Amino acid sequence: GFMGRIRSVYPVASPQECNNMHLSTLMKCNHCDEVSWQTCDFLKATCEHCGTENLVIEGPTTCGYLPTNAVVKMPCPACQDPEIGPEHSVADYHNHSNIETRLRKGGRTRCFGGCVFAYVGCYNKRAYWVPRASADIGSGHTGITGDNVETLNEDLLEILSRERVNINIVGDFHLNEEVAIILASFSASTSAFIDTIKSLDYKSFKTIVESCGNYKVTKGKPVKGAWNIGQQRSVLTPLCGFPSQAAGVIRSIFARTLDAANHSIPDLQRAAVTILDGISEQSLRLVDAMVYTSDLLTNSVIIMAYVTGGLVQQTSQWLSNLLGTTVEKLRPIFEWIEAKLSAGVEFLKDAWEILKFLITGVFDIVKGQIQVASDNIKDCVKCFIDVVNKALEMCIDQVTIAGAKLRSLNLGEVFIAQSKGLYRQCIRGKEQLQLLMPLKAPKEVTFLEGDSHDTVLTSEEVVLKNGELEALETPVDSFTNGAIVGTPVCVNGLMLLEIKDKEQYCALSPGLLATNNVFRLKGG
Ligand SMILES: [Zn+2]
Ligand SMILES: [Zn+2]
């Protein structure tokens, strides 16, 4: 506010070095009829569910952890009104502030959740108040003041009066709301928090929380007498009353409630977008960082609706990247997804789970079909994978390399899919190739490009041979756990790596490494 008065409070050079406090009262919201801790100033509170501004009514209140250079900013009626204006006297503020005050020996004060606030001045038509006295139940928390407060107050006390508060992750470590708002408590801007929240894991959560706080972080699954992080606890609780801006965004995002009603998912998505943008210009990028890079667990409708809308584009991207081609022949997959997204809330959590598979799922491509690696694949995901595999099976045909017929996959580029991996049929000419070619044989040698196991090359003598070919389903690692070593052979015009005692041969790649497709010679 006025620089001289603020500097008598804090060793502060500019009003912007002052940190806003988190104030909240437990009260019902007329619009949503729910009783929730609502963020507020001295007179107005906002529902974190409804998002509607309300008038503070008597109830338990708290100021949360007190930050450095703490202030409570409020719109100034006097500064806003045209007649009185930005220049006004301390007592003229108090007349139109419509904030009832108690007169102490130091001057007018106002109390809130165990802090006594004093008015320093207006600045940019906003009043600044500072806490002249502030309780501490430990870790800077101001405690709760109200009628049935001790039950909650005693829990808070046991976690917080410790020199080092103990964070205990009870199960497996996962990004949920409580973890997010604890990390957010350390970030001076929402933008900064975005970068820190990426690729989060127990170690990084441990190093960050411990470096920047009086915390000790334990992953003992068995719970202790301190702050236990299990699952599904709201960030709308005084223990999570951190005052920073990022924490404020995270608390709002995870508290909004959108009624899915009979709306389709792309409708809820458009609704989600506007709700999220009003919270913060960074919130879309914040949720994206949390969902796509740190495996956020939540049941929030807004967060789920924001990311799962679209979905076809995210699915096409996922498909194009692992098939290495355009996926417009796979049209059936996208119609199905459009259809299920139109169902609305019914499909919402299945959309959520499909998305998470696209991001972190573990599979291989075998005989032109996706094969997942885990049997805890959810029922909604098994159904989705079988939608995809049925679309691929429409694109399956037969290519015949000279000597044998091999399973094809016509996807705007023909791929070979007899075995694990998708193989291009790139032919490079013997001209200039590293290994010397007898040129006895036609220069119709074929390579096949794709996933390649490391190879050792005993001798570079090339050995032509002929006879008919057999296509074999067997994987190379099944017969070769160790790196495969061999001397090249060309049968009818493509390099098949060979070891003589084994009756099997494997195809070669540009760069001369071995591949999964494997063949044998007629009659063994
Ligand atoms: Zn409400
Ligand atoms: Zn004023």
Question: Nutshell version of this structure?
Answer:
The chain has 524 residues and is α+β, with helices and mostly antiparallel strands. Helix 5 runs antiparallel to helix 8. One zinc ion (ZN) binds at residues 29, 31-32, 34, 47, 49-50, 52.
Pick out its properties.
524 residues; alpha+beta; 4 domains; 7-stranded mixed sheet; 6-stranded mixed sheet; 29 strands; 23% strand; binds zinc ion; Non-structural protein 2
Oligomeric state? monomer
Domains, number: 4
Say how many strands there are. 29
Over the alpha carbons, how many angstroms does the gyration radius reach? 33 Å
Shape field: elongated
Which molecules are bound besides the chains?
zinc ion
State the major sheet: 7 strands, mixed
Proportion in helices? 25-40%
Instruction: Give me the number of helical elements.
Output: 16
Strand content range? 15-25%
| Secondary-structure content class | alpha+beta
How far apart are the termini? Answer: 91 Å
What does it look like?
There is one protein chain. The longest helix is centred in the C-terminal third of the chain and has 16 residues, at 345-360. The chain is 30% helix and 23% strand. The chain has 4 domains: 3-134, no CATH class; 162-253, no CATH class; 265-279 and 295-394, no CATH class; 425-521, no CATH class. Strands 21, 23, 24, 26, 27, 28 and 29 form a 7-stranded mixed sheet that branches. The protein has a 6-stranded mixed sheet with strand order 1-7-11-10-9-8. The protein has a 6-stranded antiparallel sheet with strand order 5-4-3-2-6-12. The chain starts with a helix and ends with a strand. Helix 5 (177-184) runs antiparallel to helix 8 and helix 9 (265-279) crosses helix 11. The structure holds zinc ion (2 copies). One zinc ion binds next to helix 2. Residues 396-524 form the CoV Nsp2 C-terminal domain.
